[PDB]
């Protein structure tokens, strides 16, 4: 069963919002996939940010939209065509 | 008083198109956050939502379905629309539309319109 | 998608009972439920909204919980107008009903 990422953190100096968590050393690529939601306002459907990328971080800009609605995200880990659960994130409001 | 009701063709063919019009009064479209859905269901059978339209024109549809429908709104009359193409048998049910509850963070459907029941059938 | 799984269909149940209907959601719906409850040709009735919020003039004998993926709604003394259809709904990414669970007396 594939390791899930940890410590799920939002940030954002400026409007410009990036995700960035961890995960551990592994004798293979970890590569990674981020989805982000709004809330409040609207309630869509989970959208991909970044999908399978080796670093850890990934740039939202791109998917801010309407300051009244929150953000929440989640990312997964793959490793071959094995998959990890998600590390679902805690909410995100104002800058 | 906050209304809705569901106008239908009845009884419709196959691989026809289905338009179904949800008149309502009571509020407005434009308001901001305000938003209408359909939902269909069959006799017996559980409730199946088809599409959501927001008052800036968002519009949100059951991937299912996509591809068959259409949802559009006309403010100046206070009408939501929508459209289905290919009509099947399957499709034969009863359709309601309701508004999106008007409270930041809910999107449970308040009011909902008695429905209208159509039959697809040669 | 998300998924709402209410079982079952039915419950035979008698009046004067508590009654709990289960409802499970796939993932993490973060408290975006709804309840709605319907007879027999009539379109569904809203009863609880947030997985706890009655509705007004919904009769205190209802109430909802849950949390996560669980959540349940109770009806202290079911009573003839209670006898209906319930249906879960997820709101949290676009929506999702739950297969419902027709009140069924027993005799």
């Known amino acids: 069963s594939v390791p899930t990422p940890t410590n799920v953190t939002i940030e954002s100096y400026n409007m410009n919002p990036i995700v960035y968590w961890e995960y551990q050393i592994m004798p293979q690529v970890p590569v990674f996939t981020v989805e982000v939601k709004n809330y409040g306002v609207k309630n869509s459907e989970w959208i991909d940010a970044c999908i399978n990328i080796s670093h850890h971080y990934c740039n939202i800009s791109d998917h801010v939209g309407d300051p009244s609605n929150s953000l929440w995200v989640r990312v997964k880990a793959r490793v071959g065509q094995k998959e990890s659960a998600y590390a679902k994130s805690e909410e995100f409001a104002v800058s | 008083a906050v209304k809705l009701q569901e106008s239908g063709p009845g009884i419709l063919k196959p691989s026809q198109t289905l338009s179904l019009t949800c008149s309502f009064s009571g509020f407005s479209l434009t308001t901001y956050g305000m938003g209408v859905g359909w939902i269909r269901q069959s006799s017996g059978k559980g409730l199946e939502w088809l599409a959501h339209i927001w008052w800036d024109d968002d519009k949100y549809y059951n991937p299912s379905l996509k591809s068959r429908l259409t949802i559009s709104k006309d403010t100046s009359r206070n009408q939501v629309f929508l459209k289905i193409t290919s009509v099947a048998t399957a499709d034969t049910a009863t359709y309601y539309c309701?508004?999106?509850?008007?409270?930041?963070?809910?999107?449970?459907?308040?009011?909902w319109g008695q429905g209208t029941t159509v039959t697809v059938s040669s | 998608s998300v998924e709402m799984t209410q079982s079952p269909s039915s419950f035979s149940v008698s009046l004067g009972d508590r009654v709990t209907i289960t409802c499970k959601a796939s993932?993490?719906?973060?408290?975006?439920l709804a309840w709605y409850q319907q007879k027999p040709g009539n379109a569904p009735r809203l009863l609880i909204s947030?997985?706890?919020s009655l509705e007004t003039e919904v009769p205190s004998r209802f109430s909802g919980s849950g949390s996560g993926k669980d959540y349940t709604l109770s009806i202290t003394s079911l009573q003839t107008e209670d006898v209906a259809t319930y249906y879960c709904?997820?709101?949290?990414?676009?929506?999702?009903f739950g297969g419902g669970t027709k009140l069924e007396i027993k005799r």
């Open positions: 947030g997985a706890t």
């Open positions: 993932e993490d719906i973060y408290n975006r």
């Open positions: 309701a508004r999106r509850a008007p409270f930041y963070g809910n999107h449970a459907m308040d009011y």
């Open positions: 709904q997820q709101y949290w990414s676009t929506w999702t």
